[PDB]
């Protein structure tokens, strides 16, 4: 009965149609194509520095485009910016809220941002304001926690939120220029494309969606993970992206293929993935795990090339420098560790 079940019929049929369409294209896996390629062997990275300071669980981090100044936050409401090379607080910004779920670094390095259960994204000018460094803009709009945010530029930032929506903001007016709706679950993260004209988000509805920044719409939705996507990371060439998820698997997705190219997981790895990032060449896919450890995967051969062990608690974040020189890991253990 009702017109409702007719629309229901149509949607299901389109969904199966799409499943069949993708099935026709899944003609091989990446590993099968890379059979001739020799493995990197065994990656063995050692911790160079350990950024101490946070008196509580670190929930995020982000390198500056200079590949040296990185920002980080923790449950003790402290948005700290450090000098990785020397190991010292270049900034220690106390936030009115301790529950910080994300933090961003301006590509210009002139500002940063952060938010969480406060459902706001606060920008912080770290340069154009001498000495007293404080929130020069608070972005209000989301009706749910801020899960992840990424700077497009000084006056533009896109954020994801538990309110089930992502949003593009104009920092000057504080107005949400564009809204991105499509996910039926609390969004957890986003990752901009190399051009930034497009971006991809991972939501709790176990799907990642590609959105056109200018149009403010959904280009395509990706399925595969049988659980929520905690992390997402665009591939250097902008044609693919990786995802981290609670089903304990990392997956590689290709925008032109509209489906995954590979899955990375071992039957004895059952803890969820928190963070995910590629090496400079994209040869390695690093993922942070709840087991306090981070595994480095050979993206090409799907082998687990290494593992960065060193955190007393869950690895919550990890980032790779713009110069591919190093990787940093943030953990619930309150410490940060650089590996090179």
């Amino acid at each position: 009965m009702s017109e409702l079940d007719q629309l229901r019929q149509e949607a299901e049929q389109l969904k199966n149609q799409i499943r069949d369409a993708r099935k026709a294209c899944a003609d091989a896996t990446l590993s099968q194509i890379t059979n001739n390629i020799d493995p990197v062997g065994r990656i063995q990275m050692r911790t160079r520095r350990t950024l101490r300071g946070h008196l509580a669980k670190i929930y995020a981090m982000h390198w500056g485009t200079d590949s040296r100044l990185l920002v980080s936050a923790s449950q003790d409401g402290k948005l700290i910016i450090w000098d990785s090379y020397t190991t010292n607080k270049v900034h220690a910004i106390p936030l009115r809220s301790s529950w910080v779920m994300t933090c961003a670094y301006a590509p210009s390095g002139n500002y940063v941002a952060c938010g969480g259960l406060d459902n706001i994204c606060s920008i912080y000018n770290l340069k154009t304001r001498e000495g007293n460094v404080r929130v020069s803009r608070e972005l209000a709009g989301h009706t749910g926690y801020l899960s992840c945010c990424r700077f497009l530029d000084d006056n533009q930032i896109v954020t994801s939120s538990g309110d089930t929506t992502c949003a593009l903001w104009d920092i000057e007016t504080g107005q949400q220029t564009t809204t991105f709706t499509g996910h039926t679950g609390d969004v957890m993260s986003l990752s901009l494309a190399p051009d930034t004209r497009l971006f991809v988000s991972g939501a709790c509805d176990a799907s990642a969606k590609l959105w056109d920044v200018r149009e403010g719409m959904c280009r395509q939705t990706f399925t595969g993970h049988e659980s929520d996507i905690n992390a997402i990371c665009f591939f250097p060439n902008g044609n693919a992206f990786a995802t981290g998820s609670d089903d304990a698997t990392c997956r590689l997705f290709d925008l032109r293929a509209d489906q995954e190219l590979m899955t990375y997981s071992h039957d004895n790895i059952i803890c969820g993935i928190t963070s995910v990032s590629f090496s400079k060449s994209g040869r390695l896919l690093l993922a942070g795990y709840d087991d306090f450890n981070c595994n480095v995967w050979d993206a090409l051969k799907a082998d687990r090339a290494g593992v960065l062990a060193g955190h007393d608690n869950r690895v919550s974040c990890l980032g790779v420098t713009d110069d591919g020189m190093a990787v940093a890991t943030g953990s619930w253990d309150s410490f940060l560790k650089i590996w090179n």
């Binding site: 409702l4 369409a21 939705t221 509209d258 060449s281 090179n340």
Partner: protein, 68 residues
Amino acid sequence: APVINIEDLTEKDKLKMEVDQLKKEVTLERMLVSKCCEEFRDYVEERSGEDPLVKGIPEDKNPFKELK
């Protein structure tokens, strides 16, 4: 919804919007996975050369070295 419609839909208006999205997606020109895998393999191949984290780097050149 989009910027021109923050939030204003019914438990059925969404079904219509969902199928519309699906109608567009169903016609996505999809590339063969092997094709995507080869281009991926290739991109990474003419790149893995200078990948610091893969080939390592000498202490003396390592930005996160000692003090000297």
